[PDB]
Amino acid sequence: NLLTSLIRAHLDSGPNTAKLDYSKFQELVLPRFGKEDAGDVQQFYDLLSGSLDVIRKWAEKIPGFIELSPGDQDLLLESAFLELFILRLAYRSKPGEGKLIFCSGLVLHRLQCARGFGDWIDNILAFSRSLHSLGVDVPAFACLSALVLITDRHGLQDPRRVEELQNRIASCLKEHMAAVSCLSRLLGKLPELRTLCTQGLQRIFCLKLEDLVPPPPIVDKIFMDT
């Protein structure tokens, strides 16, 4: 069934919590001061680039995403990327502790992220606990995230296919959350998520302009989409 394949796809795309990765983690007390250097930017960029790989291996595994055309397959992806990056990160992070947890299991302190991400990081954590107040069970999240991906995108081959897959996922979510308006409180989180992507596009524009290290292709593509 569709739900099951969405739960699994989510759970496979997630970090292994038995192996969160603390090799870079440090519990800092005082803000990192100054301007950000090339190391800050390169980290931020790698984290970005890392997640695209995983979000794609998550995409593939959605019932009938592989079935679509290669044109739309990468278009739903690059267009959903930043929103997926932020929502998955907000979902799996730990705002009480100041821990950002990334798709590869990497754990970073809010204060370690602040130079590359900017004040954006603080809004992302605000959005994290906002998600966490509400409670969003795994099946609700595993449908919500596929809906961020499979959605009409100006310039899609057969948006009938996308629109069709979309509505199945949409009724899984509707059904599952009726089995558990709840759905509309969860949907009431996506305007917050939208504000987050805009601020992220702005930091990424700002970093593109310092040009301290060459961006990864995703930075360009996400920015070209503007």
Could you tell me the CATH number of the domain that includes residue 35? 1.10.565.10
Tokens of 57: 């291996």
The domain tally of the chain equals: 1
For the chain, breaks with the C atom over 2.5 A from the next N come after: 180
Residue type at position 4: T
Query: How far is Cα of residue 94 from the mean position of the Cα atoms in its chain?
Result: 15
Which amino acid is located at 24 in the chain? Answer: K
Q: Identify the DSSP state of 17.
A: G
Helix axes 159-179, 2-13, angle to 10 degrees: 90
- With left for phi above 0 and alpha for psi between -120 and 50, is residue 64 left, alpha or beta? left
d(CA 74, CA 78): 6
DSSP state for residue 18 in the 8-state scheme: G
Distance CA 221, CA 204 (A): 11
Q: Do residues 225 and 78 touch, judged by C-beta distance below 8 A?
A: yes
Contact yes or no for 39/116 (Cβ under 8 A): no
Q: Which run of H or of E encompasses 38?
A: helix 38-59
The residues with which 101 forms a beta bridge, in sequence order, are 107
Rounded Cα distance, 24 and 177, in Å: 38
What is residue 95's three-state secondary structure?
A: coil
| Tokens coding 55 | 């979000």
Determine the 3-state secondary structure of 107 from DSSP: strand
Q: What is the DSSP letter of 66?
A: T
Per the listing, tokens 């809004």 go with 123
Residue 107 to residue 93: CA distance in whole angstroms: 9
Using CA atoms, how far residue 145 sits from 4, 156, 190, 215, in Å, is 14, 19, 11, 26
Q: What share of the chain is helix, strand, coil (3-state, %, to 5)?
A: 65, 5, 30
Beta-carbon count within 10 A of 162 CB: 22
- Domain span at residue 15 reads 1-226
Q: Are 146 and 139 in contact (CB under 8 A)?
A: no
Beta bridge partners of 2: none
How far from 148 is each of 38, 80, 162, 171, CA to CA, in Å?
32, 6, 12, 15
- Return the H-helix or E-strand segment holding 109: strand 107-109
Closest CA to 101 of 25, 10, 27, 195: 25
The C-alpha atoms of residue 32 and residue 191 are separated, in whole angstroms, by 30
Give the position of tokens 């992806």. 77
Cβ atoms 31, 114 nearer than 8 A: yes
Resolution (A): 2.4
Length of the chain as a residue count: 226
Helix, strand, or coil (residue 27): coil
